[PDB]
């Protein structure tokens, strides 16, 4: 009813049923030269199509990605450039708040860069529901851990409403303008979480559609990168769910490491322009 | 100060300085079989030495833990034999708190069943603080996940001041009978997490010792069973800070099934003993 196990749609359809509605693609990118190219080029024949504008918001990468984006023909935009009247900020949320002022699409889709080979029909896929249903305005994805381990349980926990979302941290999906720009954005790995936990709290378990978008295998990164993701969804969903975090970053060890975390969201990006 | 990088106790110096309390040793077992004998065989020689009491508490195993167990010299009390007034719930936290009616030790030392070859200091090296010295009542271990990505992110967002503790979760640990009779314990995986908490809670940090005891193997146990697992170490973790739980289950995904989750504490053991 809300779930799309399979999704049918064709990219001649979708552009059909855009009627006058533009489509903006985010590729969030740090250090991310080995498999940009592929994210690029998977999306880049939908241009002009049914896609109107892909960026890869660069968040301050110092390996090739920037150059290998540019070759790939995509337009690449620093955090600097997206906004640069306010400093920046490190961490995933600043880049994906900042890409909204990079972009103009009524429909803004984000994607990951560290999708190993993505399927072309990642966006058409992910922009359906948008476009034939009515009332949807957040579509999430999911596959077939910190979702498995962390999100997952602490939603059930705390808003179990929305256990029924297999991939509450996914990479993948896409929104309207209207709600975007009307959330705020959590830090870091924060964002992600927090955009759901928001727009349901804000519009219902009926405006959030999920699509199955296949296969894909993990990316096995380190345990303590892992450690620190995990504190921060633990502390935007906790602020989400009215209970005070201490703001206290996650230690590691000897010897004893403290990992960042923050508990200031980027404000809705409404708020910016006036 | 309060942490032993290295425990350097001798169970000759140890068993003198008991002066008068007795230890027990329980090993808590649910289908055991391939590791129970060689954890008991650890431990055995102390028995009547530094140790005065050694129990498997076995949890409804239907392998051949009970016999092995047996064969190798150890007294197996079921849950039902423990407190034969009271039926049986479910879970290790029940198997814990059934154990402080079936020993009688002042000192009350833990080891999980299914450690791979354990070194037969870890009981004298847990034990060594609660006996030397003075106003510790709870030692934990440590070694050199569900304890790196929610145990530990939630106590650095909750209960900070526990940021330190290396092994929350551990399932060696000792403690005094005083404390442990007068704690909740928490149902099924939450039992650790909530002795932590509530000792802390009650006790301060300083009541609380941390000893390492080497290197071990993390057991590869299935991502299901670890989600269950988090979601209990989750629910019990927010009572303990006052957060109102759900007390909806975790769900996995096709088909759909949901994980059992308990919001129900055993009462201090002192309850049961008028």
């Known amino acids: 009813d809300t779930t799309w196990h ?9 552009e059909a049923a855009k009627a006058g509605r533009t489509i903006s693609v985010v590729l969030p990118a740090l ?4 498999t940009i190219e592929s ?3 998977s999306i880049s024949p939908l241009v002009d199509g049914l896609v109107d504008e892909l960026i890869v918001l660069d968040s301050g990468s110092t390996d090739d990605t920037e150059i290998r984006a540019i070759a790939s023909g995509a337009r690449v935009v620093s955090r600097e450039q997206a906004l640069p009247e306010v400093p920046v900020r490190p961490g995933k949320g600043e880049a994906l708040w900042r890409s909204l002022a990079a972009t103009s699409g009524d429909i803004v889709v984000f994607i990951d860069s560290d999708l190993i080979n993505p399927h072309p029909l990642f966006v058409p896929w992910l922009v359906g529901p948008l476009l034939t249903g009515e009332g949807i305005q957040l ?14 349980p602490l939603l059930a926990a705390l808003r179990p409403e929305l256990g029924c979302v297999l991939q509450p941290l996914s990479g993948e999906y896409a929104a309207s303008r209207e709600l975007l720009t009307s959330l705020p954005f959590a ?7 927090g955009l759901l936990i928001d727009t349901f709290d804000r519009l219902g378990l009926d405006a959030i559609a999920q699509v199955n978008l296949g296969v894909r295998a993990h990316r096995n990164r380190p345990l303590d990168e892992l450690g620190a993701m995990s504190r921060q969804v633990i502390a935007t969903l906790l602020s989400r769910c009215g209970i005070p975090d201490s703001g206290v970053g996650l230690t590691q060890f000897y010897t004893r490491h403290t990992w960042p975390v923050s508990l200031v969201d980027r404000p809705p990006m409404k708020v910016m322009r006036p």
């Open 6 to 14: 399979r999704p049918g749609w064709t990219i001649g359809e979708l």
């Open 31 to 34: 250090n991310e030269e080995a």
């Open 39 to 41: 994210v690029i080029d």
């Open 139 to 152: 579509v999430k994805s999911f596959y077939r851990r910190v979702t498995e381990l962390v999100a997952r």
């Open 187 to 193: 830090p870091g790995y924060g964002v992600e979480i």
